[PDB]
Structure 1
Amino acid sequence: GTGYDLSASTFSPDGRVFQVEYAMKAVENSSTAIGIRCKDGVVFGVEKLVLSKLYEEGSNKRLFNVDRHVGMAVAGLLADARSLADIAREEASNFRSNFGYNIPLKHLADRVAMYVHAYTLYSAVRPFGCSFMLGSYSVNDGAQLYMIDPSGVSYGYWGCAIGKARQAAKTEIEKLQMKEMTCRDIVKEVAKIIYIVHDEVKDKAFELELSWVGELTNGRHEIVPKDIREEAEKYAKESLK
């Protein structure tokens, strides 16, 4: 390719917008950020690597509270992802101001995907480099999980594995029953997954982040308590060997 990859306003001979492949190539170099949905809520298992340990425990946070009932887990550049979080917050606030009830999830996904895809046509902008996932739960409807790529696609899943280890991790979610077990007995599976997938020689150390939503939190998206994170880590460390 001579110059067919210098702009987002150019189709290559076979038909391809190379600048988007080149962007998504960025998320293939970040840490794994899987998340699932069984029967009553969503659960994310983001993992943040340890670098320059002089930092505090809780820097480079990769789990935002987009709204009172939805949660986000990102993967890739943090700045663009923060911008998109602000975008989603504004969208969900305007929706409520105009209509008068909590926004659903399908509409949020579609709107944010339109915003993301607006940048895949012109040459005056740069395609995003983040691929995130949204999770929510309600009483009228049920549990809803989604995912977005830098191109603007929105599909509904039962389990996702955004990150560099996109493969070899989805398999570890197949054997599990991601529709029957309740939202309390899956933290262990997610933890042991992200633990056994991790490489111990190419990387020094890491820290584990979590989240929760469902009937236990009454639809509110909150961090996972530490008293159960202790037993989760114990389960993982005992199961690895």
Structure 2
Amino acid sequence: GYDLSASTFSPDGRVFQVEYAMKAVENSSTAIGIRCKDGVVFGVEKLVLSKLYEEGSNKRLFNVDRHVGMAVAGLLADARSLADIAREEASNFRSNFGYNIPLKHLADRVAMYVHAYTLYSAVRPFGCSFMLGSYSVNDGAQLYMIDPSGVSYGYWGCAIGKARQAAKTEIEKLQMKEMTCRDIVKEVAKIIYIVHDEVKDKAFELELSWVGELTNGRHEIVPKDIREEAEKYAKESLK
């Protein structure tokens, strides 16, 4: 059988172990990113598997540098490992070159690390996909997504996890190029509520973060009051 090692091609030229890692991501609940006029907004449908957990357990949004957020889907221990790799890459870049890592370079560097786990019987591919978002006056808003194969591209809008397609269909309806982060957070909440399957998974938390002109290029959690209004807007829009 041709699907047991990332160092074996199948006869059609596939690397099934990478495809299987992708299936782990596609089983996870949905995360979205949207780039807009003045920043990037992330949102995650964070399924609550027990009411015994604290609100805030198993965050899927991370700060990887002061100007860079990361949003994940897939196997969470793998994702946290990658957040640490991203952090180290950003820190090393600052020490060596003396300025904040450009988002595109950070994405490319972490993608190459992910890629290195797709060649060998000695290790397995990461079971996660993640988005990286930043804003600066010089570089504007940037949103990248990296998958288990190590491919990295830039996006206006992106979604990862099980309702990815349904989410992309909703993101496509927005003229995000002309909208502000404050407008977009509502829309992010709205879209998470639309694609959530309330019959098949009972309870979720909305996790929101942003980076933009309004945060002075710092990646931050969306303030509690704004998140709560965004949820109320999303719920009422579901009508």
Distance 2:94 2:167 in 1: 37
Deviation at 1:187?
1.3
Q: Secondary structure at the match of 1:87?
A: helix
Deviations 1:42-74 (A, max 9, x none): 000111111121111110111111011000000
Equivalent pair of 2:44/2:60 in contact (CA under 8 Å)? yes
The aligned residue for residue 6 of structure 1 is: 4
Displacement of 1:230 in angstroms is: 2.3
Cα deviation, residue 12, structure 1: 1.2
DSSP-derived class of the 1:26 partner: helix
Which secondary structure does the structure 1 equivalent of 2:95 belong to?
A: helix
The within-5 A match list for 1:101-120 is 101-120=99-118
Q: Distance in 1 between matches of 2:10 and 2:225?
A: 54
Per-residue deviation, 1:205: 0.9
Distance 1:139 1:119 in 2: 35
* Secondary structure of 2:63's aligned partner: strand
Whether 2:21 is the aligned partner of 1:18: answer: no
Aligned to 1:207: 205
* Secondary structure at the counterpart of residue 98 of structure 1: helix
2:142 counterpart SS class: strand
Give the alignment's TM-score, normalised by structure 2.
0.98
User: Separation in 1 of the partners of 2:179 and 2:140?
Assistant: 15
Q: TM-score, normalised by structure 1?
A: 0.97
Map residues 1-241 of structure 1 onto 2, 5 A cutoff.
3-241=1-239
Q: Deviations over 1:132-191 (max 9, x none)?
A: 000000111100100001001011110011010111110101111010011111111111
Instruction: Pick which of 66-75 and 49-58 moved more.
Output: 49-58
Aligned partner of residue 177 in structure 2, secondary structure: coil
Deviations 1:76-110 (A, max 9, x none): 01111111111111111111111110010111111
Q: Distance between the aligned counterparts of 1:62 and 1:207, measured in 2? A: 11
Work out the CA distance in 1 between the residues paired with 2:98 and 2:161: 37
CA–CA distance in 2 between the matches of 1:203 and 1:11? 37
Q: Do the aligned residues in 1 keep the contact of 2:40 with 2:142 (CA within 8 Å)?
A: yes
Deviation at 1:192, TM superposition (A): 1.1
Distance 1:190 1:122 in 2: 38
Q: After TM superposition, where is structure 1 displaced by more than 6 Å over at least 4 residues in a row?
A: none
Paired with 2:150 and 2:73, the residues of 1 have a C-alpha distance of: 15
Separation of aligned partners in 2, 1:152 and 1:233: 33
| Structure 2: gaps (5+ residues) | none
Instruction: Determine what percentage of the aligned residue pairs are the same residue.
Output: 100
Q: Give the secondary structure class of the aligned counterpart of 2:56.
A: coil
> Matched residue of 1:44: which SS?
strand
Paired with 1:220 and 1:167, the residues of 2 have a C-alpha distance of: 30
Q: Let me know the Cα RMSD of the aligned residues.
A: 0.9
SS in 1 for 2:5: coil
Specify every segment of 5 or more residues in structure 1 that has no aligned partner in the other structure, as ranges.
none
Higher strand share: 2
Separation of aligned partners in 2, 1:164 and 1:67: 28
Are 2:132 and 2:144, in contact at CA under 8 Å, matched by a contact in 1? yes
Cα separation, 1, equivalents of 2:201 and 2:116? 36
Contact 2:71 2:131 in 1 (8 A): yes
Give the number of aligned pairs: 239
Shift of residue 206, structure 1, vs aligned partner: 0.6
Mapped to 1, the partners of 2:226 and 2:106 lie a distance apart of 31
CA contact (8 A) 2:135 2:211 kept: yes
